[PDB]
C-alpha cells in the first residue's frame, strides 16, 4: 500500500501561516489531504512547547488543534524544556521507509550521514499553501522520478 507519511508540523503551520503565525489549521489540511488520499499512517511532529500559552514570540492559532491530533494518535510532541524535532522527522521517516513532507531540506542533517542525505534527496515532499489549499508537486523528483501517486506508494 502506501509509504510512512511525516509530517514537518512546525513548517507546515508557519507556511500556512505565512512565516508569521504558528497557524494549525495548516497542519489539520495536510493530514486531511492524506487521509483522503487513504493514508493511514501518517506521523505530525511538533515540539511539546507549542501546547504551552503563547508568547509574543512565538504566535499560534488554532492551538486547540493538536490536542485533537494527538487524540487521534496522528500527532506525537517531541520532547523540550526551559530542536529536537528535526532529527525525530528524518530518523522516523528514515527508518519506517517513509516520506518527509517539509520545505525544510535539513542541511545540518544531510552533512551529518551521506544515507540521510541521498534520502532527503529521494523522499522529500514539498508543498505550497494557496490559502487552505494544500498543494504538494504532481512531480516531486521533477522527471528524474515518479508522478505523486506513486511517490507516495510502497511500489508503482
Given at each position: 500500500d502506501l509509504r510512512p507519511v511525516v509530517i514537518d508540523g512546525s513548517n507546515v503551520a508557519m507556511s500556512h501561516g505565512n512565516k508569521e503565525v504558528f497557524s494549525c489549521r495548516g497542519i489539520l489540511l495536510?493530514?486531511?489531504?492524506?487521509?483522503?488520499?487513504?493514508?493511514?499512517?501518517?506521523?505530525?511532529?511538533?515540539?511539546?512547547?507549542?501546547?504551552?500559552?503563547?508568547?509574543?514570540?512565538?504566535?499560534?492559532?488554532?492551538?486547540?488543534?493538536?490536542?485533537?491530533?494527538?487524540?487521534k494518535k496522528i500527532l506525537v510532541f517531541t520532547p523540550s524544556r526551559r530542536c529536537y524535532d528535526d532529527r525525530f522527522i528524518v530518523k522516523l521517516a528514515y527508518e519506517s521507509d517513509g516520506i518527509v513532507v517539509s520545505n525544510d531540506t535539513y542541511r545540518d542533517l544531510q552533512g551529518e550521514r551521506q544515507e540521510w542525505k541521498r534520502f532527503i534527496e529521494e523522499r522529500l515532499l514539498m508543498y505550497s499553501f494557496v490559502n487552505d489549499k494544500f498543494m504538494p508537486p504532481d512531480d516531486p523528483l521533477g522527471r528524474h522520478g515518479p508522478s505523486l501517486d506513486n511517490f507516495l506508494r510502497k511500489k508503482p
Amino acid at each position: 500500500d502506501l509509504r510512512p507519511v511525516v509530517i514537518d508540523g512546525s513548517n507546515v503551520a508557519m507556511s500556512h501561516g505565512n512565516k508569521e503565525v504558528f497557524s494549525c489549521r495548516g497542519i489539520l489540511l495536510a493530514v486531511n489531504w492524506f487521509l483522503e488520499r487513504g493514508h493511514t499512517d501518517i506521523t505530525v511532529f511538533v515540539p511539546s512547547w507549542r501546547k504551552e500559552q503563547p508568547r509574543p514570540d512565538v504566535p499560534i492559532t488554532d492551538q486547540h488543534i493538536l490536542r485533537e491530533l494527538e487524540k487521534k494518535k496522528i500527532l506525537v510532541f517531541t520532547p523540550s524544556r526551559r530542536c529536537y524535532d528535526d532529527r525525530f522527522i528524518v530518523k522516523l521517516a528514515y527508518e519506517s521507509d517513509g516520506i518527509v513532507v517539509s520545505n525544510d531540506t535539513y542541511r545540518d542533517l544531510q552533512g551529518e550521514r551521506q544515507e540521510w542525505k541521498r534520502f532527503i534527496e529521494e523522499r522529500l515532499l514539498m508543498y505550497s499553501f494557496v490559502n487552505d489549499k494544500f498543494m504538494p508537486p504532481d512531480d516531486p523528483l521533477g522527471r528524474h522520478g515518479p508522478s505523486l501517486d506513486n511517490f507516495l506508494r510502497k511500489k508503482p
